[PDB]
């Protein structure tokens, strides 16, 4: 009714506050407006917690590859704008999506393995406590480096439709995500892969 | 139809996430409906993006943080005719132990030798991206990628380390595929074998003692250095770091996790 109009007006509000040019915003539907809104708040919450614990553009352009952050559950918490130069997917297509949808089926299991602290994903909170308490390069930093090759869905490839990429980075705690238990208590932050994704030539 | 519940649900799930991320919204006693969650999301989002002007997901310093969390390096800028050491990042000092002021208006040769530096002499000319590997540095690896517009390049660190897991005796129960490049073996050639079987005779007591001590450290890390027999039959110096943990699923006794680095 008029309520459906009230809901849609707030979605329009949200869309107009998204940090992208009007030509990108106008192409988004209501579902992406929400996805990207959530995406934006999650990233700002992370940096707020990092701020509490106390170029750039040229460095981004210098890399042969794009910056990528994947959460413990395989969510694309951040992808830099240059992702489009490698895969044809825009930053807005990818943000807060499931990483496994963009990974070749036969590599998905490996990629999942790379996200786990011991490369042993279940098919645990106590040891992450030590890793968390160790921070604020800790004792455990040598166990959390990651360098692997994976096939990534690529709209710029006309053969397999996949680009073979090397993912190089570290597992770091993704703060400020405000996950909560059934009881209501705030869950501790989980490890996410902070990496550069570069094509193997 | 009513055929598309999946988009209807996704919206609802996103609305719930907005409720979690909007500070005052989660703290409310009365569980707010969709409209009021959205309105609070608007206010908070408006507050975050600020009073204009141009839209950007991350600010420049935030982007910098993400790159330097993932990679380990620094930005350096030079010219073809002159030196010219134009600009260097503040995160140059942690990458290679040498202070900030030493690059400002100083010689380019000082940290790159020995002794050529003949490759870079013609790399400067336009003939256009120009990526390369360079000699830096022993005081007291820099694979630098960049583009010409005068060069603008990062100075950054392939695998030299691998993870493994072991039972209490030292038997490989899991091997990270980075072992191939580092010690020459496929995971299958190490699984089932004891790590001590790849340890040089003179290092065996040291290695056994280290595994007895790591158990007593109860989750704290100990490093040890020893000679590991690679696939090509050469002895390779390796630093292993190791700690135990109580594995749930098996309740199984202490589980050794190791990272193995060729120095």
Curated annotation (Swiss-Prot), chain A:
It is found in: Cytoplasm; Nucleus. It comes from the Eukaryota. Disulfide bonds: none annotated. Highly expressed in testis, lung, ovary, spleen and pancreas. Highly expressed in mononuclear cells (MNCs) from umbilical cord blood. Isoform 3 is highly expressed in lung, kidney, spleen and thymus. Down-regulated malignant tissue from different anatomical origins, including colon, breast, lung, stomach, cervix, and ovary. Residues 1-44 form the bHLH domain. Residues 55-122 form the PAS domain. Induction: By 3-methylcholanthrene (3-MC) in MNCs from adults. By the heterodimer AHR/ARNT. Mediates dioxin toxicity and is involved in regulation of cell growth and differentiation. Represses the transcription activity of AHR by competing with this transcription factor for heterodimer formation with the ARNT and subsequently binding to the xenobiotic response element (XRE) sequence present in the promoter regulatory region of variety of genes. Represses CYP1A1 by binding the XRE sequence and recruiting ANKRA2, HDAC4 and/or HDAC5. Autoregulates its expression by associating with its own XRE site. Interacts with ANKRA2, HDAC4 and HDAC5. Interacts with ARNT; forms a heterodimer with ARNT. This is Aryl hydrocarbon receptor repressor. The chain holds residues 38 to 278 of 701 of the full protein.
From Swiss-Prot, chain B:
It is found in: Nucleus. Its main location: nucleus. Residues 1-48 form the bHLH domain. Residues 1-34 are annotated as: DNA-binding. GO terms for molecular function: DNA-binding transcription factor activity; DNA-binding transcription factor activity, RNA polymerase II-specific; protein heterodimerization activity; protein homodimerization activity; RNA polymerase II cis-regulatory region sequence-specific DNA binding; sequence-specific DNA binding; sequence-specific double-stranded DNA binding. Residues 18-133 are annotated as: Required for heterodimer formation with EPAS1. The keyword RNA-binding does not apply. Residues 18-67 are annotated as: Required for heterodimer formation with HIF1A. Monomer. Homodimer only upon binding to a DNA. Efficient DNA binding requires dimerization with another bHLH protein. Interacts with TACC3. Interacts with HIF1A, EPAS1, NPAS1 and NPAS3; forms a heterodimer that binds core DNA sequence 5'-TACGTG-3' within the hypoxia response element (HRE) of target gene promoters. Forms a heterodimer with AHRR, as well as with other bHLH proteins. Interacts with NOCA7. Interacts with TACC3. This is Aryl hydrocarbon receptor nuclear translocator. It comes from Bos taurus. The gene is ARNT. The chain holds residues 95 to 464 of 790 of the full protein.
């Amino acid at each position: 009714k008029r309520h459906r109009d009230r809901l849609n007006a707030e979605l329009d509000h949200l869309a107009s506050l998204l940090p992208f040019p009007p030509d990108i915003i106008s192409k988004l539907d209501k579902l992406s407006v929400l996805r990207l809104s959530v995406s934006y708040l999650r990233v700002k919450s992370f940096f707020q917690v990092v701020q509490e614990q106390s170029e750039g553009r040229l460095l981004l352009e210098s890399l042969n590859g794009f910056a990528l952050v994947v959460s413990a559950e395989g969510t694309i918490f951040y992808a830099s704008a240059t992702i489009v130069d490698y895969l044809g997917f825009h930053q807005t297509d990818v943000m807060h999506q499931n990483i496994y949808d963009y990974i070749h089926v036969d590599d998905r299991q490996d990629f999942c393995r790379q996200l786990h602290w011991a490369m042993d994903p279940p098919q645990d909170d106590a040891i992450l406590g030590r890793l968390l308490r160790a921070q604020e390069p800790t004792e455990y930093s040598a166990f959390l480096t990651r360098c692997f090759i994976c096939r990534v869905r690529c709209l710029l490839d006309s053969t397999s439709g996949f680009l073979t990429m090397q993912f190089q980075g570290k597992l770091k705690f993704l703060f400020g995500q405000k996950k909560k238990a059934p009881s209501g208590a705030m869950l501790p932050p989980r490890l996410s892969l902070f990496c550069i994704a570069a094509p193997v030539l | 139809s009513e055929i598309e519940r999946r988009r209807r649900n996704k919206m609802t799930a996103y609305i719930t996430e907005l409720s979690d991320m909007v500070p005052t919204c989660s703290a409310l006693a009365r569980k707010p409906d969709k409209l009021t969650i959205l309105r609070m999301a608007v206010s908070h989002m408006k507050s975050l993006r600020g009073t204009g002007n141009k839209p950007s997901f991350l600010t420049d310093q935030e982007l910098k943080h993400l790159i330097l969390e993932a990679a380990d390096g620094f930005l350096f800028i030079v010219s073809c005719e002159t030196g010219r050491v134009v600009y260097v990042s503040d995160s140059v000092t942690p990458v290679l132990n040498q202070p900030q002021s030493e690059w400002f208006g100083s010689t380019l040769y000082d940290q790159v030798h020995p002794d050529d530096v003949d490759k870079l002499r013609e790399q400067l000319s336009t003939s256009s991206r120009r990526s390369f590997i360079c000699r830096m540095r022993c005081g007291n690896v820099v694979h630098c990628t960049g583009y010409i517009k005068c060069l603008v390049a990062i100075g950054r660190l392939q695998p030299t380390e691998f993870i493994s897991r072991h039972n209490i005796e030292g038997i490989f129960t899991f091997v990270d595929h980075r072992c191939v490049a580092t010690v020459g073996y496929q995971p299958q050639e190490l699984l089932g074998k004891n790590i001590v079987e790849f340890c040089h005779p003179e290092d065996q007591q040291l290695l056994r003692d280290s595994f007895q001590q790591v158990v007593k450290l109860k989750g704290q890390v100990l490093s040890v250095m020893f000679r590991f027999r690679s696939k090509n039959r050469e002895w390779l110096w390796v630093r292993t770091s190791s700690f135990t943990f109580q594995n749930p699923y098996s309740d199984e006794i202490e589980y050794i996790i190791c990272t193995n680095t060729n120095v």
